[PDB]
């Protein structure tokens, strides 16, 4: 398997970064009976899901890792058919109710109650808790109050702001900061020593960390790709490998900066259409485009300020809209006008 | 005492030729009625434009005397339950009423876009099972919300809002059939108030005829419950913001007019302000629409109307 | 064990145990002396003792045993909608009134009605409140309502007219800190100097949120070893409050005004996982209440913070919004 | 029958004509006529306007205003109209806002960039792109369901991060090793419950310099035949 | 004994005006073109009196048989009221040939699904049943229900008529009301007699001596749960004159101690600022635009302290143009 998955820590002892959080999780697992509801919030690819699984293993055992998958169908008012992919285990459940759109609440109430009927307790891990609707969060608070005896919720999110105060009061907030570049370098060094990868110097690993912006998953996958390209021998001159969509977005940024015209906008539209059609989210496209534009060295302070203002405006418009290409094209046109 | 027959009900279209707008769709329906063998169809368009009325007229033309029992109209969002309405559909469809060979039993479903995928699939199965005798017409607002298997089997017809010419033609026909004394300005006012709403236009015409007998602008505006267009025009075209706010306070807000009526009349009046350049009219319409959207989201206060007037004045002074 | 939240555990038992609400308690005692209890509208700042006082009044009205069967506590804000709350109220009213025992009758007045308490009533819509008024009118014979709210002006006039209104004054800082200190001493919670003041400041004087945060801090302190005192950093972490040092660094980066430095700092800050909304709130608190900025700067920054908060409330990217806000502030 | 499909083209061409936006042309073709043009086939008019508003040569440019500023203002209005359309078509059913969506999506952007059609009126490409995006999202959902037990990521994280390395572990070895990499490719697929259909679907998710169509076509047919035969000759985890 | 039911207009004489509705409906009945009517307007204008007078004129001695009076706010349920409508429509009498009238009071309180079901029922039974729908606001009804009903708007009562009715109630109930309290009550009720009567009854009840005590404006504002103009004026004066710290402290203290929501405070401040004499139009433009934006953002949630400081900053910045 990929090195990101093969060397993922399978226990609280195998975690290497954020020692304080590891000690806190060990203390939490030392008293399984009084386990509180948890809400782990932090940047993507920092190890939240890995830490949740390690805590579950500490409480129950290795059997949490013997994971099964099952599609569960829910009967709802209006007689609609909804299917949810539950990753279950003989000790815990994992759900992503946001995949059910605005039906997530009726998905949760039907499911969690059932679990409470099937039961010391069974843990439920809710992914993307920040993207749940407010009604779903109210239902989650109701299930926390009613079924605290048999249900312990472990919510994972990238930002706790969308979470409601009633949930925050009844749950333990756990902040998971992204690892420092030194810790990422240490992890990559352990991976390359395990995989017997040649290194001209350790600085290459440092560069990889600086390329991942604190994203451990991205850094590990980038290291694997670089090793595969360089015949398992990384040199100091080995270029940093970026994903296809990031390269496309950087090319788009260079095109926008170089030429500002209507034809350039027309071709930027085709580039954006390709990116959107190949499952690149609109918010990701906008954020990457904005932060590539802000890194151009030929733009002055006024241009960058206008760019970030337009980015904020059209980010709000993307969050309030349906057709993403409309807002992306509007943002690019405004940036082109600002630069010219 | 006797029977009550309002004009909106008496002059509702019965045959296909009684419909004014949607020339292409009406021509298609007339051809279908002429050659017989009505295919399954999906009529899509904005709500309130009488989409179901056209297929009802088609059913009247196809069956006629057998219309009273050979046509089943139902609502997909019935509060009684989707299961019970589906069972009613099946029971009606499996029946074998004697009909001429060139005609078929007809089922009309309204608000079909709200059905779930499973219900739509079940309806497709039921339609296929009894396709030899029963044909289906689905009325919807959004055509994309109907699943592809249903869309492929049906012919798509699109219904649009009636233009002012169609409303004028229908009103003239009603007036001629009712020997109603009128003036050009009265009909212009009625058409102005009802933006393609044939039922509202007919109701306003009947109320004006009953209240005053002669249909002119003054009597129409007295009958019409919306704010008077002259007052809204004075509010919009006032050269001073204080004058506009005073007009809004005294003549519209304190007169019991809701904010929705105020913004709708402002939109209608701004569309027709020929004295103003079209760019300024478009800017004013954009501001009015923004405040209308804010009102429809639940704010609907007087402060929103005051801000709309302030923005309109700011645009006017350039 | 008998685990119970400290908010419900330390509620006053009788009306005489309410500390600062002299006026409301006196008026409620006068009303209780009268044989008739009208509909009550408790309004005031959150965490002042509205629910505590209504519960104490109920306990004195019925008794420790009968009061649980004579009380329907609902939260219209947290419920699905009007239908659920109104149906629950209708079922509670239609339910037969529990017969008081000999001891309850001989020890307490035991009035022949039941009390329905609504929490966060002001959050209801106008239609919901009109429906609630209709339901109250229908069952006014055997039920007396108590509407608990922060803003009496959010309740429609027809519903507010039927209720005698009780205003609860905001708790003094000394009273709230004394209550928190008493709770901490009873529960053997070791707190460093200024921890309770920090908790009150984070809760903005809300004693309910302060007690909840103190209990959470105690629970966290049990997990950590060595039995060390709870410190302000721990309670800031538990409440999701950005440390003051990071806020000072943000302010300095804005003051310098370099776009690249601000962008770099925001990028390195978004990796620490701190909430952007907390940063916006703390920046507003810092800048608005600062004597080193003139009127024009605050006039502009209030609108800047308002726009940023409005855009953040729509579920947008925190990084972009925070960077835009910081750059806009730095350009002032 | 073809006139039904031709009508949106005629509406888009008429609404982008600059003559009806001059002072004289406004009187002959008022704002009500343009809103009525929108309300004829209101499903396609905003899409056609958004598609064709960049292909004009404007004749209504204000003095000191360039074409790029006009198209930026038109795009701003188009995005506002998209927000209004989303609010209209949601469960709120605010159909009374249809006239407003007439101006925000069709009339105002056309007024900003009205002129001579520099080319031909092209049909909206948003429908085909939306269908393609939906198909690829279904494929990504299937792949994520297959690989969920091995990868610690969500669907978007699987697309953005895992797939580039899966390309290097599932397609790159073929180019450099011929048919000798079939065993390693099958082992990697088995480690994630990836079928041959999933292998085919994965290679379709790459853009720009990572497009795999020509690279896969360049692979000898013997290698592909050996790969599929070896896959079909052994049982796989499920 | 509610005061709303008492003093209710029982005849057209008690109605100040609006005889045009009666004459139009009479002509509709005479010509046999009576549509489904929708009377909407503020309570107490005379919708119920008008419809019952028309029903009595049409039928006479058989009023109880040909008329079905229902209240949609009775909350019995959709199915029960639908069954009532169907069994009233199905009970035709040979000796009482004619259409049957159904009055539905306070129909604007129904949910959208109930309104759609009612519209479907109206279409189903339109052959022999005529529907009259009474509402406080026509915009609260669904467009499908609105389109099928001929609309009649009842204008709000003139201030002179409201004052005369208030004086009649005061002399009937031996209540003494201060002129300031009367003005406050008239302003708060916004031409709604039901609000006037309810507030007067509640204020009389709250008085320790309901026979020898005069109701002040403070009592009226407390009973209605409305922001006192003095508090709003103090807040506005603090915002306009005092510095930022004092203005912020005063606004927060006043709107937290007195329980005034930020949106209600904004509305009151706008109402007060209507009467201000401004030397520049841009001051009013900025005030209105910024305050409407703040109110719209408040409607969606957001940070309360940030919105309050936004209000203070908006007012301060607008008044920099004089
Ligand atoms: N060696 C090592 N790897 C880690 C640690 N924490 C996280 N990772 C790696 O980070 C990758 C992604 O973490 P993930 O579970 O997706 O966290 P999340 O998406 O942020 O919730 C995993 O595949 C792990 O291999 C750690 O402490 N040590
Ligand atoms: N006057 C008071 N004296 C002592 N404790 C109080 C007082 N007011 C509130 N509290 C504390 O607040 C907590 C509950 O607050 P609550 O009354 O629910 O807030 P609210 O006023 O918003 O209903 C109780 O634990 C109680 O100890």
């Amino acid at each position: 398997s990929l090195w990101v998955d093969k060397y993922r820590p399978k226990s609280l002892n195998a975690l290497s970064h954020n020692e304080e959080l590891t000690n806190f999780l060990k203390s939490l697992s030392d008293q399984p009976r009084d386990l509180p509801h948890l809400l782990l919030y932090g940047p993507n690819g920092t190890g939240k899901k890995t830490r949740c699984m390690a805590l579950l293993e500490s409480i129950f055992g290795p059997g949490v890792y013997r994971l099964k998958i099952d599609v569960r169908q829910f009967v709802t008012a209006s007689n609609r058919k909804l299917e949810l992919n539950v990753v279950s285990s003989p000790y815990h459940l994992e759900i992503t109710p946001s995949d059910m759109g605005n039906n997530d609440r009726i998905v949760i109430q039907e499911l969690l109650k059932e679990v409470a009927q099937m039961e010391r307790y069974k843990c439920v891990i809710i992914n993307e808790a920040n993207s749940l609707t407010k009604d779903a969060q109210a239902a989650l608070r109701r299930t926390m109050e009613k079924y605290s005896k048999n249900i312990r919720l472990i919510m994972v999110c990238d930002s706790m702001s969308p979470i409601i105060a009633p949930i925050k009061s009844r749950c333990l907030l756990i902040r998971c900061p992204a690892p420092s570049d030194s810790e990422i370098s240490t992890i990559l060094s352990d991976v390359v020593t395990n995989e017997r990868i040649q290194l001209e110097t350790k600085d290459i690993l440092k560069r990889i960390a600086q390329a991942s912006n604190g994203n451990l998953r991205v850094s590990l996958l980038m290291l694997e790709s670089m090793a595969l390209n360089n015949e398992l021998a990384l040199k100091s001159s080995s270029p940093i490998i970026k994903p296809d969509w990031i390269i496309v977005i950087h090319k788009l940024t260079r095109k926008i900066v170089k030429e500002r015209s209507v034809n350039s906008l027309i071709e930027c539209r085709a580039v954006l259409y390709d990116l959107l059609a190949h499952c690149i989210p609109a918010n990701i496209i906008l954020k990457e485009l904005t932060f590539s534009l802000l890194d151009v060295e030929t733009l002055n302070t006024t241009n960058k300020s206008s760019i970030i203002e337009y980015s904020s405006v059209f980010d709000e418009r993307l969050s309030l809209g349906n057709k993403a290409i409309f807002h992306l094209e509007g943002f690019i046109a405004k940036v082109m006008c600002c630069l010219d | 005492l006797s029977l009550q027959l309002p004009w909106v009900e008496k002059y509702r279209p019965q045959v296909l030729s009684d419909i004014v707008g949607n020339k292409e769709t009406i021509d298609r329906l007339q051809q279908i009625a002429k050659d017989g063998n009505m295919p399954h169809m999906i009529i899509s368009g904005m709500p309130g434009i009488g989409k179901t009325t056209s297929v009802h007229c088609l059913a009247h033309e196809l069956l006629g005397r057998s219309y009273a029992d050979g046509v089943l109209e139902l609502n997909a969002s019935d509060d009684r339950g989707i299961d019970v309405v589906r069972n009613q559909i099946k029971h009606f469809a499996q029946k074998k009423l004697h009909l001429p060979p060139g005609k078929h039993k007809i089922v009309i479903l309204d608000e079909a876009d709200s059905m779930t995928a499973g219900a739509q699939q079940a309806l497709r199965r039921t339609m296929e099972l009894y396709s030899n005798s029963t044909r289906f017409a689905f009325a919807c607002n959004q055509s994309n919300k109907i699943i592809e298997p249903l869309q492929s089997r049906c012919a798509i017809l699109r219904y649009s809002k009636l233009s002012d010419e169609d409303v004028l033609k229908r009103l003239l026909q009603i007036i001629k059939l009712e020997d109603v004394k009128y003036t050009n300005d009265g009909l212009e006012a009625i058409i102005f108030t009802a933006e393609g709403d044939m039922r509202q236009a007919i109701n306003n015409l009947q109320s004006t005829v009953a209240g005053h007998g002669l249909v002119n602008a003054d009597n129409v505006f007295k009958i019409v419950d919306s704010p008077h267009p002259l007052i809204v025009k004075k509010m919009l075209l006032a050269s001073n913001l204080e004058d506009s706010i005073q007009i809004l306070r005294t003549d519209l807000w304190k007169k019991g007019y809701s904010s929705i009526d105020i913004v709708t009349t402002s939109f209608r009046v701004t569309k027709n302000l020929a004295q103003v350049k079209e760019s300024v009219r478009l800017e004013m319409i954009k501001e009015i629409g923004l405040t209308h959207m804010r009102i429809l989201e639940g704010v609907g206060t007087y402060l929103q109307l005051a801000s709309m007037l302030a923005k309109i004045h700011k645009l006017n002074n350039k | 064990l008998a685990q119970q939240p400290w908010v419900e555990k330390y509620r006053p038992k009788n009306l005489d145990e309410v500390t600062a609400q002299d006026h409301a308690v006196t008026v409620l005692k006068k009303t209780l002396k009268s044989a008739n209890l009208p509909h009550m509208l408790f309004y005031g700042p959150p965490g002042t003792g509205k629910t505590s006082t209504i519960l104490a009044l109920t306990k004195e009205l019925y008794g420790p045993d009968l009061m649980k069967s004579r009380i329907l506590e609902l939260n219209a804000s947290d419920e699905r909608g009007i239908s659920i709350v109104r149906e629950k109220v209708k079922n509670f009213a239609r339910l037969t009134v529990s017969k008081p025992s000999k001891h309850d009758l001989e020890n307490y007045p035991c009035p022949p009605y039941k009390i329905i308490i609504l929490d966060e009533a002001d959050s209801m819509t106008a239609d919901a409140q009109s429906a609630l008024r209709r339901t109250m009118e229908t069952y006014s014979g055997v039920t007396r309502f108590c509407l608990i709210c922060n803003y009496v002006t959010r309740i429609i006039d027809p519903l507010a007219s039927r209720c005698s209104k009780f205003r609860f004054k905001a708790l003094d800082a000394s009273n709230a800190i004394d209550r928190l200190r008493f709770i901490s001493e009873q529960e053997n919670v070791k707190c460093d100097d200024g921890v309770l003041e920090r908790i009150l400041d984070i809760s903005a004087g809300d004693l309910r949120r302060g007690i909840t945060l103190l209990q959470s801090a105690s629970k966290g302190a049990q997990y950590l070893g060595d039995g060390k005192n709870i410190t302000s950093t721990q309670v800031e972490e538990l409440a999701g409050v950005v440390p003051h040092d990071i806020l000072i660094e943000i302010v300095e980066k804005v003051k310098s005004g370099d776009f690249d430095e601000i962008k770099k700092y925001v990028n390195t800050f978004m990796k620490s996982g701190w909430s952007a909304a907390s940063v916006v709130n703390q920046l507003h608190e810092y800048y608005i209440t600062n004597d080193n900025f003139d009127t024009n700067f605050k006039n502009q920054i209030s609108w800047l913070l308002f726009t940023t908060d409005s855009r953040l409330n729509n579920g947008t990217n925190e990084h972009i919004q925070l960077l835009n806000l910081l750059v806009k502030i730095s350009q002032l | 029958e073809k006139n039904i499909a031709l009508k949106p083209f005629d509406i888009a061409h008429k609404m982008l004509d600059g003559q009806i936006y001059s002072d004289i042309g406004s009187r002959n073709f008022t704002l009500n006529d343009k809103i009525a043009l929108y309300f004829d086939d209101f499903d396609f008019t905003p899409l056609m306007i958004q598609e064709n508003y960049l292909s004009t040569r404007p004749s209504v440019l204000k003095p000191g205003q360039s074409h790029l500023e006009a198209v930026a203002e038109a795009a701003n209005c188009i995005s506002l109209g998209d927000i209004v359309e989303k609010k209209i078509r949601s469960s709120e059913q605010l159909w009374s806002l249809l006239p407003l969506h007439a101006v925000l999506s069709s009339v105002y952007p056309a007024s900003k960039v009205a002129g001579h059609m520099a080319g031909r009126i092209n049909f909206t490409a948003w429908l085909g792109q939306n269908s393609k995006s939906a198909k690829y999202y279904r494929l990504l959902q299937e792949i994520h369901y297959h690989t969920r037990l091995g990868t610690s990521t969500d669907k978007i994280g699987l697309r953005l991060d895992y797939l580039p390395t899966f390309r290097k572990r599932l397609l790159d070895p073929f180019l450099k090793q011929g048919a000798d990499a079939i065993s390693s490719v099958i082992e990697v697929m088995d480690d994630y419950y990836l079928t041959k259909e999933d292998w085919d679907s994965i290679m379709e998710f790459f853009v720009g310099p990572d497009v795999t169509t020509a690279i896969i076509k360049k692979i000898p047919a013997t290698v592909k035949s050996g790969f599929t035969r070896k896959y079909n000759s052994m049982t796989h985890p499920v | 004994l509610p005061w709303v039911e008492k003093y209710r207009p029982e005849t057209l004489d008690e109605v100040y005006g609006q005889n045009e509705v009666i004459t139009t409906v009479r002509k509709f009945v005479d010509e046999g073109k009576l549509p489904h009517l929708l009377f909407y307007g503020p309570p107490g204008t005379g919708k119920t009196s008008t419809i019952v007078a028309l029903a009595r004129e049409i039928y006479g001695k058989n009023y109880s048989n040909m008329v079905l009076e229902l209240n949609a706010s009775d909350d019995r349920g959709i199915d029960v009221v639908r069954n009532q409508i169907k069994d009233f429509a199905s009970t035709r009498q040979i000796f009482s040939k004619g259409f049957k009238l159904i009055i539905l009071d306070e129909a604007d309180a129904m949910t959208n699904a109930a309104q759609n079901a009612l519209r479907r029922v109206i279409e189903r039974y339109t052959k022999n049943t005529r529907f009259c729908v009474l509402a406080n606001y026509a915009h609260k009804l669904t467009p499908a229900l609105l389109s099928r009903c001929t609309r009649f708007r009842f204008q709000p009562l003139p201030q002179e008529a409201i004052e005369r009715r208030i004086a009649n109630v005061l002399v009937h109930e031996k209540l003494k009301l201060s002129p300031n309290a009367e003005k406050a009550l008239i302003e708060l009720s916004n031409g709604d007699m039901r609000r006037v009567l309810n507030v007067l009854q509640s204020c009389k009840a709250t008085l320790d001596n309901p026979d020898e005590d005069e109701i002040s404006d403070d009592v009226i504002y407390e009973c209605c749960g409305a922001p006192r103009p003095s508090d709003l004026k103090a807040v506005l004066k603090s915002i306009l004159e005092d510095d930022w710290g004092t203005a912020h402290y005063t606004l927060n203290k006043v709107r937290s101690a007195k329980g005034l929501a930020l949106i209600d405070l904004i509305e009151g401040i706008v109402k007060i600022l209507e009467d201000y004499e401004l030397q520049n139009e841009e001051t009013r433009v900025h005030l209105l635009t910024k305050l409407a934006d703040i109110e719209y953002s408040i409607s969606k949630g957001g940070n309360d302290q940030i919105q309050g400081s936004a209000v203070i900053g908006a007012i301060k910045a607008s008044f920099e143009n004089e």
Side-chain angles (χ1 to χ4, degrees), chain D residues 73-144:
Chain D
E73 289 169 24
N76 181 79
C77 200
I78 280 165
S79 86
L80 285 172
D82 176 59
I83 291 161
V84 164
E85 162 155 69
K86 177 188 183 181
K87 281 175 188 173
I88 284 171
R89 294 198 196 275
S90 81
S91 60
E92 308 184 45
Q93 296 289 281
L94 306 182
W95 293 94
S96 52
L97 285 176
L98 276 190
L100 165 64
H101 183 243
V103 166
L104 276 187
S105 73
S106 310
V107 190
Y108 190 97
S111 316
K112 284 304 175 165
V113 298
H116 305 291
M117 276 299 308
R120 192 194 55 162
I121 294 273
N122 289 318
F123 194 76
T124 166
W126 184 90
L127 295 171
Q129 293 284 343
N130 187 56
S131 177
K132 187 175 177 177
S133 184
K135 184 199 81 162
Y136 278 118
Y137 266 112
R138 276 191 302 274
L139 290 175
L140 190 64
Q141 180 86 328
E142 293 168 24
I143 292 160
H144 185 231

Side-chain angles (χ1 to χ4, degrees), chain B residues 45-89:
Chain B
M46 54 177 296
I49 60 188
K51 304 187 289 286
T52 50
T53 309
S54 70
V55 290
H56 274 299
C57 296
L58 179 67
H60 271 101
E61 221 296 315
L62 288 170
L63 300 181
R65 185 57 58 185
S66 50
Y67 174 84
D69 83 358
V71 174
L72 165 66
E73 72 176 337
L74 281 174
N75 196 298
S77 194
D78 199 359
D79 62 85
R80 295 160 54 236
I82 312 84
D83 52 348
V84 78
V85 304
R86 190 150 44 79
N87 297 338
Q88 186 168 3
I89 288 165

Side-chain angles (χ1 to χ4, degrees), chain D residues 199-212:
Chain D
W199 190 95
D200 292 337
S201 305
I202 280 164
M203 299 307 148
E204 300 178 42
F205 278 90
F206 304 118
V207 299
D210 280 14
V211 287
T212 68

Side-chain angles (χ1 to χ4, degrees), chain E residues 30-50:
Chain E
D30 295 342
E31 294 171 352
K33 314 183 195 307
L34 176 64
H36 298 308
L37 305 169
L38 163 62
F39 295 167
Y40 73 99
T45 318
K47 310 170 292 192
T48 54
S49 67
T50 288

Side-chain angles (χ1 to χ4, degrees), chain A residues 2, chain D residues 166 169-170 183-192 194:
Chain A
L2 303 177
Chain D
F166 268 123
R169 279 288 188 198
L170 294 180
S183 56
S184 74
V185 167
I186 286 177
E187 273 184 18
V188 172
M189 291 166 69
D190 278 353
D191 298 341
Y192 294 93
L194 287 160

Side-chain angles (χ1 to χ4, degrees), chain B residues 3-6 78-79 200 206 210 225 240-242 249 255-256 294 297 299 301-302 304 306-307, chain E residues 27-28 32-34 40 82 99 117 120 130 151 153 156 271 274 281 284 288 292-293 295-296 300:
Chain B
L3 301 181
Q4 315 303 315
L5 197 57
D78 199 359
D79 62 85
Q200 177 171 351
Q206 193 189 305
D225 60 335
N240 197 293
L241 179 57
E242 316 296 333
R249 271 303 287 206
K255 247 66 172 179
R294 283 187 173 180
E297 288 183 48
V299 190
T301 67
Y302 157 83
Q304 302 298 326
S307 171
Chain E
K27 212 155 173 186
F28 284 150
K33 314 183 195 307
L34 176 64
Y40 73 99
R82 177 164 58 217
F99 72 98
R120 271 184 275 114
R130 286 292 156 209
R151 266 170 284 130
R153 203 181 82 89
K271 182 78 164 64
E274 284 181 42
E281 215 98 71
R284 208 167 274 293
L288 293 178
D293 288 0
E295 179 187 63
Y296 172 72
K300 321 296 283 178

Side-chain angles (χ1 to χ4, degrees), chain C residues 6-8 10-12 17-21 45-52 148 171 179 183 207-208 211:
Chain C
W6 290 4
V7 167
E8 310 189 328
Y10 281 94
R11 277 189 199 285
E17 287 188 340
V18 189
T19 61
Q21 320 286 352
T48 40
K50 296 168 296 193
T51 308
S52 303
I148 306 185
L171 284 175
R179 194 64 188 154
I183 287 170
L207 204 53
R208 201 198 288 198
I211 290 163

